[PDB]
Symmetry: D4
Subunit: 253 residues, 8 copies
């Protein structure tokens, strides 16, 4: 047991797992606060929760593995030559397990409030829908390809700013202070551009919680709602992150 944990790959798997768990617990707690309680919840609270959960995760795993906490970010780093391809499955697996367990924790901590709010009914759509605490669903006036464009553009902006903040050659944040700046970046992505799709901008933030809600009793409407919307938050961020990274590397690097 002691010997196994000493291996480098096991350490990196554990670092990704822990950082993703912390970030997702803070973010989903903010979303549940907003949905269930009108006095104690706000949209700004959701933005703050997700951003500074990212800050805490970066403090947890910044040096061991880079603290990607995001499958699109890992894909963009691997495809641009900065991370070897053999580390992609390990990081993605750790992020997925962390996100799934964070969804389970939020379900356990807020159980009575969910039941009191919904009247005992676990509904995907309607005035007392609660499946949106865990995953993202398409709003009323928006179509599928508009949401695809939104997800791609937001992930591209995120990747470009992430490259700018941590670039030791150009103009980085002072070492030891970059976690705060990354958290603020995520906060303002939520503040400025987060109402058209719910700004998933992360496959790990979106798919494992949807699987958990499917298992836990919300039914199969989690996948078929919004004319099969579930696959856009998995595919659009990869393309967006790659394009944003290549744009920064060509024009500013």
């Amino acid at each position: 047991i002691q010997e196994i944990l000493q291996r480098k790959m096991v350490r990196e798997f554990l670092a990704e797992f822990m950082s993703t768990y912390v970030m997702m617990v803070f973010g989903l707690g903010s979303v549940a606060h907003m949905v269930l309680n009108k006095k104690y919840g706000s949209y700004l609270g959701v933005n703050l929760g997700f951003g500074f959960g990212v800050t805490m995760g970066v403090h947890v795993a910044g040096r061991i593995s880079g603290a990607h906490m995001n499958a699109a970010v890992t894909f963009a780093n691997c495809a641009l030559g900065r991370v070897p391809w053999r580390k992609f499955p390990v990081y993605v697996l750790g992020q997925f397990l962390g996100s799934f367990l964070a969804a389970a924790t939020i379900y356990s901590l807020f159980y009575t409030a969910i039941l009191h709010f919904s009247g005992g009914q676990l509904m995907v759509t309607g005035p007392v829908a609660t499946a949106g605490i865990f995953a993202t669903y398409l709003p009323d006036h928006m179509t599928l390809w508009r949401g695809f464009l939104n997800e791609a553009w937001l992930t591209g902006m995120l990747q470009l700013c992430l490259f700018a903040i941590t670039d030791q050659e150009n103009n980085p944040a002072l070492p030891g202070t970059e976690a705060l700046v990354i958290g603020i970046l995520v906060v303002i992505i939520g503040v400025s551009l987060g109402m058209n799709t719910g700004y998933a901008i992360n496959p790990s933030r979106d798919l494992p919680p949807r699987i958990f809600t499917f298992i836990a009793g919300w039914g199969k409407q989690v996948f078929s709602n919004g004319e099969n919307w579930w696959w856009v938050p998995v595919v659009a961020p990869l393309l967006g992150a790659y394009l944003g990274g290549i744009i920064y590397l060509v024009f500013i690097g």
Copy 2:
């Protein structure tokens, strides 16, 4: 008098007393603002008050004693070998005295507003209850063991992130800037996970103010409300903090 204050144990006692007093005054002021006045109070204000009161306390006593300001944090540090056991009573005594005097100060500063709000009646429960300014009480839909689970998990998260932020080996905040990051951690614990129990996560934040309200005229219902809820915020945080610390030490340290 000059000679006595020069001793090391007296200095550490005074440091814990002062830091706890400052933190508790800011936090309870935020809570009173929220309860008494609807124009000037908000939940985000409560989160900000507690978190950045923690920041100011860390600046006051960070070097002399470590600025625990929390009996669960002291217990976890002593039980994991980082602090000697003989310093536990001194730190806990200083924290308790500071919290009690902060409650007395908040009572003195907000007296007329409390009387005007409540109509002269000091009530634990009801539409004009004011005992929740000082201590925490179980909400309507929540049971006792759900609250126990909530307190334990929140204190565990706090301890794990505290270990991550101040770890010189892994990835700490830049020295001279860690108080801000600790304050932000407390702020987002309030934002994301603080409505199910009131997020005491601190025996020193909870018990001395309850004793003060019992003495000052709210009666014995402060102890028996919520089927004897008073002992959960004293016991659950110790277990939570120990488990979070051991988890961080094993898997990330």
Copy 3:
């Protein structure tokens, strides 16, 4: 292609373009959130979006060109001898192109919400006016020369504080941390003094989006509304920035 991008002037043009684009996308997204949706929008969100978009732009282009992102700031720097006059057209052209493309992006991302809010009508004035998402318009009780005074004074305050923050001789922010302080300065300019004119302290923030709305289908009322208000946000900031800079240089530098 590789050779052309290596030239210094091309690099500075691209840096100004990218930083202005990032800042304007974040700011206009905040404004659209406020106007279209009442649940997800607030004035504080607008202030945060603009300020920390400025922070991200400074991280993008701080070292290559100085990250002015503001035509008045460039004019004041060139007129006070700190930047050569031959670089003025390049910087201004890059800022204008970035702002125009950011307006186009915000139009594309929020299209369905704009149509749903306005009922299909692109109106400059009225209860469902949407031209104020992109540019600034004079409020009900304010006259033209009052707005001129407001714009000049706000830009003067901005320039004086910008000189104070980045002055290595007097008392600067620690290198690697000044982007946060500049963002906070912009945030509080919005918070304290931004309701009389909309604080379009930047000509690049104001004119290219107005041109875009004229082209895209809001008509010629964008220019003639408010007794030809469009030229004040272009002229007043230059005078304000110059006066604030000269005041700081004489009395504090």
Copy 4:
């Protein structure tokens, strides 16, 4: 003219004048936003405006004179031996002139909004009172000596935390970053303890604006309102600041 500005006392006078002007303009702008407009104003905005105006003033005059911006802080520093007594009149005069001119500027920038809100009537008391934009007035349920206690205690807390933040021996903020921490301290003093008296905690923030409102057309009720309340915000902060400083020096220094 050039020779006169080169003297040290003239430089310190100008530094205090400029820093106080900047801080007061930001703070009074926040207060006017809150009072006049319900959509664009909030209490949190007032707290943010005052705190980060303090941050900007510290950046302006931190090294030249220490950036007291507060007559009580200057009195406490001079009485504890840290500043010579001959510099007290110069600093206080500069602060008073800066505060008076900031009040005049806020009057000029918000003139039409004030007239539209009040119906043309400059009233100290009533549903359309506007004298509270500039100075502080006692609330409905509070007496004079309760307000005296509030002012003294708040100024004492401010001075103790100011000593803690800037103490190079104990545990200071990292040099180049202390302005942010001081601003956050002022923000949370506003958030937690600022509704009982309006948290003037500064004679320079209170008396010159009251004199300006007396001159500008609000009448002599600015002085006699609240059974001659005007002198408490001048006298209580001095005692509070001295006591807080001596407490910190004895027990923590």
Copy 5:
């Protein structure tokens, strides 16, 4: 067919059926307006709908059968000697059939609004409960025997006032105008005493609609909700009406 309708008992059955149908359609329409739509519904609208539906029913069947429209009123009239006992089953049967068909009509006319409001879920309890459009359910703070007392007292008041209004010996309403006065009596019974139980005060108004909701898809919780509340609105009104009638006859007649 022509001969059968000419008989007296058939005519009285038809009169009771038609009058009950009209009254119940108006009343249940008012209740549905209140529950489903917040803009177009109010409690005063419910009171007006029930009272003046009673007025219209009295105009329909006042001379043929007396227009009881109420099983408790029929029981009290038969038990006090004013109506022969052999007419009790015919009147009660007609009233029950009319009430059942009125519930079916209200279900058909408001179908889409019910589905849109409830999200497709037919719920007896919760934030989107719709079974209360048709029948009455016990409120949160009230017990079973308190509701029994309420029903008995309200029906007694109704019967006493009905005897007073239509008494040709004492002081009746002018013939040809008594329907308006009876409607106003029902309106003010709703206005003054109708929130503790929903003021059924009519077995025919309560039981057939509950049977319809049981059949139509709300389930068996319509009968077991509120610890078997369904039988109180059937039994309490009979006793109340008898006591009120005997009191009026003894003390005023």
Copy 6:
């Protein structure tokens, strides 16, 4: 027992008792609806309840005794020669007993709602005061003699209009329809002039319910509240009614 109830004086006593009971039950039910529940209560409901309770009482006792239901009306009729003086005690006694029992009935029917609203505390003053359901209390900005003037003038208007409505020689309401017109008169007295004192305009409506609240557990503050306000609603209506009656008799009769 069959002959004691046959006497004329016993009949008139019973008529006054029953009519007062009915009127007071409807009125106090309306007031309780307004105070306890915000959804189901309104001021217009209070006006309607009192006015049409007067209508129902007039139908109950219009011919037997005149249906005064008001001690001031009885005093004015006796003092102007229309009723013999020996009938004054009998009528007043019946009205007082009816009002007392109506207060007891309203207490019994609304018990759980009162306890749930007030938190178990029976308070005369404060945000959860419930003594105003039964009696009238002086508002915030009104003095004692202003209320005296209000009561006298309102009772004078009531008496003048009552004389006009029931005058067979001038222009009466058609016999058999005057109860509706009297009810409408009371409704509009409530609508137009009822917020300065609560428009008791009746000693029987005011004193017996106050005695009941004193007995039932609200304490002796019911009498001393508002600097001994209890005696004005007993004395002012007599003078007002006499003056209004004499004015009508002289100038219109």
Copy 7:
């Protein structure tokens, strides 16, 4: 000119014209009050306006022509043998002209309010739609045949109650008082059943105002909105009125 106005048919044409004009002016004024102004408008006001406008029209033309004011009522009376068929065109023509001129009058009286509300845009659909002041449009969740059923059933109820109120052989309203009862019937039809379609229940209330809005500048969308909804309010009321009349005649007559 005197000779022509003395004929019978001209007299009945003028009676129908005047009564319809009065009724429509009151009703459309109520609707405009509700739509344009939130302080001065309510749904209950709309119900009252239409019902008591019907009362005033009945007083105007009750004896000369019967005061149908409704093409469906005229059709039902003619088809059941109570009115000769040769009078149908004259009555319908008078009603149509009266309704058209009432729409023109309401347009002239409320012109500035309409322009101020809509921003100068005459829109059929959207947040500032104003075509619903004059005609009826299908709500969001309702289909065409549901609205057909609603219109037919409401007109049937109206005709049955109209037959009951004015039947001299069964139980009529006292002659000279039936206009009030008819107005109350229309009021409660609005209160109970008027939100699903807008309760036109009258071709004359619906078609001429729609023609006026088409002419006056709302465009051709008045006819094609709601999937050619315009013809349902013309056809459904005839069938409903006939069925209700025949039902009353067979079963109660």
Copy 8:
């Protein structure tokens, strides 16, 4: 004294005085309730107060003088030959004196509420204007001749319906019940058409209260507000009433 009051002309003068006083007291009380208090006031209350004050005045003076209570109604009756011209000054003088004294009474009864609402300032325009309790003022978006048209048309409708209600040849209200119908007519004139000008429709309702406010301390702005609006409510009703009367006489009489 006894002999003088016996003369016919003195009797008619006193009847007009008393009826106008009663009507105006009820109406102005309703308006004051609406303006001063938001909980206890509504627009429907204003309509009810004015209409049923008209009902009570008709009961007071219906037989002695006809109960015009309106100078336009008197002018129309005199000009159409129904009343001799020599009675015009007596009726108008009585109405004017009654209206003036009713304004004085409303001023005396609501004095403290007016002072508390306005802060001691008697203002014609602004957020705390109180001159509109007594007279009518032109709204924001309306011009002078639009208001002239509104006043003329409303008075014409009133006169036509008044002729219809009291016409013994055509179809009158049953004698003894016409006061209720006249009150309802005034109520629905307020409900449907009363927001564009305040529906004075009466010179006696408008001018004497304006004179009282000029005398009592509101100043000369009562006459010059709204570009000399005061004379329209005196002149437009006469023309409107004459035209409506002549239209009814020609086409329906």
